Amino acid sequence: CTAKPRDIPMNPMCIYRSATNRRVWELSKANSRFATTFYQHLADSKNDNDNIFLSPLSISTAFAMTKLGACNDTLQQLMEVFKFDTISEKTSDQIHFFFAKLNCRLYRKANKSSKLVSANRLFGDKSLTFNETYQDISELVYGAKLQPLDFKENAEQSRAAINKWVSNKTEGRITDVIPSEAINELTVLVLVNTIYFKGLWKSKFSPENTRKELFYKADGESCSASMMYQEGKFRYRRVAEGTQVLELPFKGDDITMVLILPKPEKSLAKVEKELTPEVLQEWLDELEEMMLVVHMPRFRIEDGFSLKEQLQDMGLVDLFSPEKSKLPGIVAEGRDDLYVSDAFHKAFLEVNEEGSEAAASTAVVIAGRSLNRPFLVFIREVPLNTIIFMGRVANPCV
């Protein structure tokens, strides 16, 4: 951004290779393929009846930041895993450009509708000499200023410093991205991303009409749930196997939630197993204006988890290997031999008669300490083809 760069600015350090915004659309595409693939995996590691919420977008946005200082294999798996190897061509360095155009259109609205604001940031060790170019590129592309932190003698407050910053950037919604013993005296850097959304229903529900129901859990007893109610014309479509798909657009119609609910008594897993950018575009394409009666619970969910286990299973292995990890572009002089000790994510969703609110954050930490009847949800940026948030609502009660 800054204005409209002819992608003429500089952008060195280790390059891998396997109206041109078509490059950006390709980015979003690859961003989505990662989203679905990750959810699948994440799902595998969670209980089918368990809740789920995240922001695939942020995860790809913190890892793109990390990729900046990557080299060789570590760079390969990063580009491939996050699907960056499906874009225009030879330039592990150019992707950051598109992702800086993408986030640009996303968060920079010459239109003002709903709230969608991101904010990245680095937190390096006060003793180290970080690469100037790396530090400068990050601030330009991802707009991430390198905030000095005392990990060598104050990892605790250092953690507390990061979590706090994030909270600030998540309207208090996100808190505890970095677990208690994550960061330590050996921690070099900690790349972070935050995303915050708040949108008013283009067609709001009526609190009056809302009514408390009785929710039966996978085991034992219920839990009361405030079920909402409204009626109107919405883009909908009962897809194959009786699967329903509905789209609730927020004011501006630029961003809309997308619920997906399998036929009564049918398994959602079968739906999550065959979930894919392709399939998703399919349902979304088959949608059609109609009159209906929408019933959806008034609730909020908060997810949290380490991305290490899953990302390892997808291919991002070298990055977490103290031995094989290659992030030579970060510290110019000081502590070397860096590797991602672990990565964390945390998302929050809230839904009510007035609209929806959701927030998330991802924290990649360098060299530290390692370690109910559902329905699907989606928060997409239509014009941009990006899945901002996603998840599965399994307990409205909460």
Curated annotation (Swiss-Prot):
Q: What is the effect of changing C397F?
A: In AT3D; type-I
Give a GO biological-process term.
Answer: blood coagulation
Outcome of swapping R369H = In AT3D; type-II; Glasgow/Sheffield/Chicago/Avranches/Kumamoto-2; increases affinity for heparin; deprived of inhibitory activity
Site feature: Reactive bond: R369, S370
Disulfide topology: C1-C104, C14-C71, C223-C397
What does the UniProt record report as the effect of altering T91A in this chain? In AT3D; decreased antithrombin activity
- Effect of mutating R33C: In AT3D; type-I
Q: What is the effect of changing F34L?
A: In AT3D; type-I; Budapest-6
Tell me what the record says results from Q77K: In AT3D; type I
Reply yes or no: does the keyword Signal apply. yes
InterPro entries from the entry? Antithrombin_3_serpin_domain, Serpin_CS, Serpin_dom, Serpin_fam, Serpin_sf, Serpin_sf_1, Serpin_sf_2
Q: Which GO terms describe its cellular component?
A: blood microparticle; collagen-containing extracellular matrix; endoplasmic reticulum lumen; extracellular exosome; extracellular region; extracellular space; plasma membrane
User: What role does this protein play?
Assistant: Most important serine protease inhibitor in plasma that regulates the blood coagulation cascade. AT-III inhibits thrombin, matriptase-3/TMPRSS7, as well as factors IXa, Xa and XIa. Its inhibitory activity is greatly enhanced in the presence of heparin.
Q: Mind telling me what this protein is named?
A: Antithrombin-III
